[PDB]
Every structure is written in structure tokens, then in C-alpha cells.
């Protein structure tokens, strides 16, 4: 029979509406993990005779209690979680020198992987990350076990073994091309020999800046004939979109040199793209490129904006990122909140007429990353034939860090509650976290 | 003899130094609040003889926990705490139709204003605010429990009964002129009878917009024959600038309405001050009048960016304000993180040339904040002869939001662990809230 049937209040998004609020409504988890149905609960009667459930089976959710999607972390460096809320202090380029270098460096010490690894899947599950799509470092054996740690917690990622052959500010923290292309391919074969449900590799050439031709090329290849996902980052900061421009002065523009590379592809995400014009943006679309809007790093190290209502404009795909470390937040929720006042700095600055809303935000950091990471299939909402990935908001938990009124339920601001929980909620009131059925937070 | 001796790392701001941490010291508290003595523990001898105290009488921090001073939360709107993390979707002034001021009339009925009032008082003093500036609402009897709420918690205190006799949009909420006037002195007057040991009366014109030059200048002289402080705000947002230009034709500049009209005085707070021209600061200055950074609130609701390294520049005092609920969050906390972002904002639109370091921001919520409250001789830092308001700060407490690892303390990033709680802390890692040497939080 089914795993689990709710009842209670459901809040997602579809893509012609960025929140539907489903109020007292049954949703039915199959053994497989799959939602299997969901209605309002004057179906009761109907789905217990179909679904052969008794009504004692039902776990109804308190009165104050709403079921969403889990938040999909399109882009999040797993190796940086060690320094975390820390170091923000620095541009990009002299911030990886200082920073960022040294410490993915540690990785090579197999043991040290393991602490801050383990840490960061069990950090972004109970803050309610049920996907994240994870930079790990230039290793391969660390960077596995990255995989396996996000297999033993029941968290739906994407690993991706970092890859590198030029670094002249830090040279000890570089490979080989011939080093990087083999290792890339040991770290997709050995990766594909665990046959992990729902941890898979993802083809990480770190940025053109680290990658030459030859690698840029050959990893473009090897995710062509193995049928992989491409990340990287592009156009964060104005200083790496000139850096580029003089290491390859040959290419109009730094989407070119991702795309002439075989590195722009529709399984691609990109991170940032906060420099990328019009023109660029429309090669994206075409080729079903996504990004990885990560506002928390664009503002702390002060690289730029996003312009979001842009990226929309021209139907490229978008999700929403933390950028650890660069961005200082594990939650997706501060990724939230940041998106939206960053929509707001360039509604301030007369860039755009509009700022995004609250809810429109809610659906890119649910079912527009679920989108841009090419799951949205299986993953972003709720609907019948998806995994049940999933996290319960308890607003009233305990020592919640919000305080709910009468008002929030019988007033005038619609929604009051939902909101109350994006703007001011953290994981004390995320009380269960579920990935593709199966309850991972609590922890066991 | 002494209250409480401390020994333990102090985290404090100076006149000369943003961040100084003064790593195992004796701090010694007296009967009546005041910080006693402050040295390194070697001084453990000297300080028993001298104080007279016992070895086994000094409390003795964990080894990775640490004091700082009580923020200071300069501009809060404890009547807007009911839908605080709800709203922030019009701009000021459509804000205040439409949420604002429908919430602020309820409270005339007594029962819904201690309610509110309670959770408010509570929730910001378990978030280390140990001095909060509140606007309350028109009503004097209402305003008048809030004050008598914050002695009960012992929070350090302002309290202002808001004064409004101009009100279009929200006819219903506002006063006569005679009305406003006569009930400002009774509730200075009732304040002053109740002789609360750190709670104030403070003369509260809304702002420009909703008070008449008759009832201005009046709050100007109840100010000035009573000598008390003055709060309102000031050129938040572009329309309301336009809004005084059109009300107040004959005054060159909005911070001319105030200060011709008495209301811009050496102990004047003015919130926002995002559209004050190098002019108008210059006139704050000479008047010793200060401004209350309120970031989440100038992000928020679309209304812009005070520039605080000008504000600096022009030697006019400054502290960092919630703005509950036009900013959404309770904590200063998140007002040093929004303030941080926001200097960010303004080097990455090339507007300054370098941004505040996470330190001087920490500085502005604690000691600037004392300073634009005309407090500084009493609180703000660890000095001799100054009130204990302290919060106590555990990374490592239960539940904690903070991964701490071996490199935060013995790597490369200086005060990683200070920064760390700063980036992300919450009421979780503060274990403990003291007010002139007494414990408020844990509550009893
Ligand atoms: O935010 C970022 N974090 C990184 O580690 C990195 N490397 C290249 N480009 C980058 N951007
Ligand atoms: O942020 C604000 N909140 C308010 O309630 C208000 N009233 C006038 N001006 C204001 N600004
Ligand atoms: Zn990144
Ligand atoms: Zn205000």
C-alpha cells in the first residue's frame, strides 16, 4: 500500500501560477515515492475505495501546518562550507586566492572531506535543501565521497569533481589537462558504478579562467558521449568578464567561449550571470542553458545584480543558488529573500518598472531550479507522478523564530502566514524534510 | 560587594577601533549595573584584594563563547510587530494606506495593544536588543503600556506617542492639532510620574506629511521646555520627498520643515535619510541631530540606499534601526547584515569607492547607535563606568545555526568566529541578555 496520506494545507507553485495555496486537500505517497494522488479531502470517500486506504491511515497536519516542495540549490560549494559566514571581504578573484584555494586544497586529506561534507548535506536538509547541486573540489576520491554522503542522507544532488589546469595565484591547487580529463573520467565511471538513486555526476569545469581550450573541449566531449549535465560560472564580476576577454581575446564574448567549447548545451547551469548582455542571454535560450541566480555572493563580495525580470524576458531557465561560500547563507530561504531585494535595488535604480514578488521568488527557488537543473519531471511541486520531495512548515513550532495572530488567519494580508515563515523562518520550523518519499530529516 | 565578575573574551567597539576583542579578561559588574573593572585575567590577584572578592565568585565563560554589548535598535515600530514579515510590497507610502495605519488604529482597544506589545518587547530582547527606540501609536494610553511592558522585561527604552493631525488616505487615523498637543503632555507628563529607572518619553511627530506646522512646532517646544529627545523620519523614499516639496513649498529642503520648526535638534534621531543631500547632512551635523540606518526597510519597500559612508564623511551620528515592519525583520542582526549589503550596493554602482567592513557596521549597531541616541556615556561598549548591556554569545549552543570547525580558531581567517555569528547567528547563540548589569533573557 501507500507510504503516507496527508491531509492539511499544501503551498507550491505551477507554471502558470507562482503560489497556489491548496487548503485541507489529501495527497497520497506511493512505496516507490511517488504522489500518487492529490485532491481536497471531500475525495476522502472516492480515494480510500480506489487507494484501498482506511481513514485511521490518513496523518492529518495541524491547523497551522503546510506541507511545500523542497528548495532546490542550483548552485552550492560543498568543499567552502568549512569558512561559511566568513571571509566575504574580497572581490571574487583575490577573494579565491586568499580564501577559497587554500581550502579546497585541504581536500586532498580524505578525513578533512569527510567532516565538512558530512556537515553541509546534514546543515542544507534541515534547513529544508531536499536538491543541491554541489561544487566539490579538483579530487576525485573526495569529491566521491561528497556522493556518498549525499546517498547516505537520502539528499537528491548532483556532485561534480572540479576541474582546473590553469591557477597562477595559487599553482599547488591545479591539475594537469591530461591529469583533469582522466580523473574527470574515473570520477564519472566509478559514480556511475554505485548506481545511486538519486546522487549522479555532473561535469564541472570550474570557469574558463581555470580551464584551457583543450579542456574546456574535452570535457564538453566527455559530457556529449556520456549524456551528462555541465556547471560552471559565468560573468559574475566585471574584473573576471575582462580577465577573460584577455586570456581569450579570440572569442566575442564569454558565453562564446562556453559554447565553442561544447560547454553550453541544454544540460548546462551556469552560475551568476550577472554581466551577461541580451545577445548572450538569447544564445542561453537557444541552447537551453540555465543559470543559477546567487544574489547572497553578488552582494557580499559586490560583484553585481542579477537582472531576473531580464533573464525571464528572455526565457532562459532560473533557479535560484546559495553559492556557499561566497554567498555567507546555507538557506535557500535567505537565497529567497536576497533574490527579492536585489529585484528591488533595480526597481530603485529605474533598471527595470517592476520588482518580483515574494511568490514569484518562491516558484525559482522551488520549481524553476527543479527547471534549470533538467528535474523538473520528477521534482518542484506537487503533482501526481513526482517524487515526494518535501518539507512540513510548523510556524508555531517550537521556539519558533516567529510569532503568528489571529490576524495572520482572519485579516486583510493574504497569506500572511506563508510569508511570515519566507521572510522571517528557519529550520526550527522545517519539523520534516522528505526526498523522493522517504523521511531524511529527522535525523536517525 | 560586586553582582557579577566575568572572566572570558569581551567583543567591543571603540571611538578609535571597529572591532576590538579582548580575549580572557575580568569584567567585573557592580550591585548598582555599572562595569567596575575591566583587565586581563592576570590582574585576577590585584582585582580580589582591590574588589574584594573571591576566586570561586568569578564566573568563568566557556572557552569558545563570548560577551558583547546589547544592540541597539534605533528606529522600531513596536505597533507594526503584529504583521512584521508580511507586506513589503507597496512602497511607503500606498504601505502606510493600506497596512499601516488600519494596524496602528487598533490599538485603541488596550487588550490588543498588550498583546502586541508583549510579544515584541520579548522577541527583540531574545534577539540581544537591550535598547530598542519604539514609535508606538497616537493613543496615550496604549504608548503608555508599552513603556510599562519594557520596565517589566527590563528592556533600555524610548517610547513615543506618535503624533499625526494631517492623515488623507486614513482620515479615521489621526488627531485634532489641540488633540495631538495636550496628549503628548500627558504622556510625558504620566511617563515622568511612573519614574522608570530606563524607560523614556520621546516626542514623536510622524512626519512631515502628517503633521501640520502648528502641532510641529508645538512638539518642538514640548521638547525643548522639557528637554526630551525627538524622533520622526526623514527623505526615506523619492515620492514622499516630492510629497513635503508639494505640502511645505516654502521650506528649501525637508530637513528645513524640521528644523524650522523645532524639530531638529543635538538630541533629534531622524530614520532612513536615504535622499538627504550633502547639505541637508551638513545641517545635521551642526545641529548634533542624528540618523537611524533602517537597510532591510530601504530594500524592502523600494525606497533606496542611505549612503553611510557620506553620512561618516559629513561627521553625522548614526546607528542602524529594524524598522519593524517596513523592515521585516525584528533583528539587528540582520540590520548589520542589511547595512553591510547595502555599502556593498553603492561600490558596486561605483557610487563610493570602497564599502563598511562587517566591524564597522557591528560598531554602528552597538556603539553609533548609543551615540545617535545621545547614550554613549551610559552604554554601547565595555567601558569603566558604563551599564552592564550585554549579550552573551554561544556558536556551539543547542541547536545552534553555526558549524564551528578547528580552522575557525586556530586557521587563517582572522575573528572567524565573531563573523561567523554575525553572518549566522539568530536568538539560538545568545544565551543570555543583560540590562544595567541585571539578566533579562532568560526570562522568568
Ligand atoms: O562564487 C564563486 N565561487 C567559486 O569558488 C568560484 N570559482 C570560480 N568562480 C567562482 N565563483
Ligand atoms: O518606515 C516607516 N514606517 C512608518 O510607519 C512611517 N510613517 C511615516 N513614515 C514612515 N516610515
Ligand atoms: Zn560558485
Ligand atoms: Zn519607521
Chains 1, 2 share one sequence.
Not at 566568513?86 to 586568499?98: A, F, G, Q, R, V
Not at 577559497?100 to 529544508?128: M, S
Request: negative net charge; aromatic residues 10%; glycine residues 6%.
Amino acid at each position: 500500500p501507500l507510504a503516507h496520506i496527508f491531509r492539511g494545507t499544501f503551498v507550491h507553485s505551477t507554471w502558470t501560477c507562482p503560489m497556489e495555496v491548496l487548503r485541507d486537500h489529501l495527497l497520497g505517497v506511493s512505496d516507490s515515492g511517488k504522489i500518487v494522488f492529490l485532491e481536497e479531502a471531500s475525495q476522502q470517500e472516492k480515494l480510500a475505495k480506489e487507494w484501498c486506504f482506511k481513514p485511521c491511515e490518513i496523518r492529518e497536519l495541524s491547523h497551522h501546518e503546510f506541507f511545500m516542495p523542497g528548495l532546490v540549490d542550483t548552485h552550492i560549494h560543498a568543499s567552502q562550507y568549512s569558512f561559511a559566514g566568513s571571509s566575504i571581504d574580497l572581490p571574487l578573484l583575490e577573494w579565491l586566492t586568499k580564501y577559497t584555494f587554500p581550502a579546497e586544497h585541504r581536500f586532498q586529506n580524505i578525513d578533512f572531506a569527510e567532516e565538512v561534507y558530512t556537515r553541509v548535506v546534514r546543515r542544507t536538509l534541515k534547513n529544508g535543501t531536499t536538491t543541491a547541486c554541489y561544487f566539490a573540489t579538483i579530487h576525485t576520491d573526495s569529491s566521491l565521497l561528497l556522493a556518498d554522503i549525499t546517498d547516505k542522507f537520502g539528499q537528491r544532488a548532483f556532485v561534480g569533481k572540479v576541474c582546473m589546469d590553469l591557477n597562477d595565484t595559487f599553482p599547488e591547487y591545479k591539475e594537469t589537462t591530461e591529469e583533469s580529463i582522466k580523473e574527470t573520467e574515473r570520477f564519472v565511471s566509478e559514480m556511475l558504478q554505485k548506481n545511486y538513486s538519486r546522487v549522479k555526476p555532473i561535469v564541472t569545469p570550474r570557469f574558463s579562467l581555470s580551464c584551457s581550450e583543450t579542456l574546456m573541449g574535452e570535457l564538453g566531449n566527455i559530457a556529449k558521449t556520456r549524456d551528462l549535465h555541465i556547471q560552471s560560472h559565468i560573468s559574475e564580476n566585471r574584473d573576471e568578464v575582462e580577465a577573460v576577454k584577455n586570456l581569450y581575446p579570440s572569442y566575442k564574448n564569454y558565453t562564446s567561449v562556453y559554447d565553442k567549447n561544447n560547454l553550453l548545451t541544454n544540460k548546462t547551469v551556469m552560475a551568476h550571470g550577472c554581466y551577461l548582455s541580451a545577445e548572450e542571454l538569447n544564445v542561453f535560450h537557444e541552447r537551453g542553458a540555465s543559470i543559477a541566480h546567487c544574489p547572497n555572493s553578488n552582494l557580499s563580495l559586490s560583484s553585481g545584480f542579477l537582472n531576473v525580470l531580464e533573464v525571464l524576458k528572455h526565457e532562459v531557465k532560473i533557479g535560484l543558488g546559495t553559492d556557499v561560500a561566497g554567498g555567507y547563507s546555507y538557506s535557500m530561504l535567505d537565497a529567497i529573500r536576497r533574490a527579492v531585494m536585489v529585484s528591488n535595488i533595480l526597481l530603485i535604480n529605474k533598471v527595470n518598472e517592476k520588482s518580483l514578488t515574494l511568490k514569484e521568488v518562491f516558484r525559482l527557488a522551488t520549481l524553476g531550479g527543479s527547471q534549470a537543473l533538467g528535474l523538473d519531471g520528477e521534482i518542484g511541486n506537487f503533482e501526481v507522478g513526482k517524487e515526494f520531495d518535501a518539507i512540513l512548515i510548523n510556524p508555531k513550532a517550537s521556539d519558533s523564530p516567529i510569532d503568528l495572530f489571529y490576524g495572520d488567519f482572519f485579516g486583510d494580508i493574504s497569506e500572511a502566514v506563508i510569508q511570515k515563515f519566507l521572510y522571517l523562518g528557519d529550520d526550527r520550523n522545517i519539523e520534516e524534510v522528505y526526498v523522493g518519499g522517504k523521511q531524511v530529516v529527522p535525523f536517525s
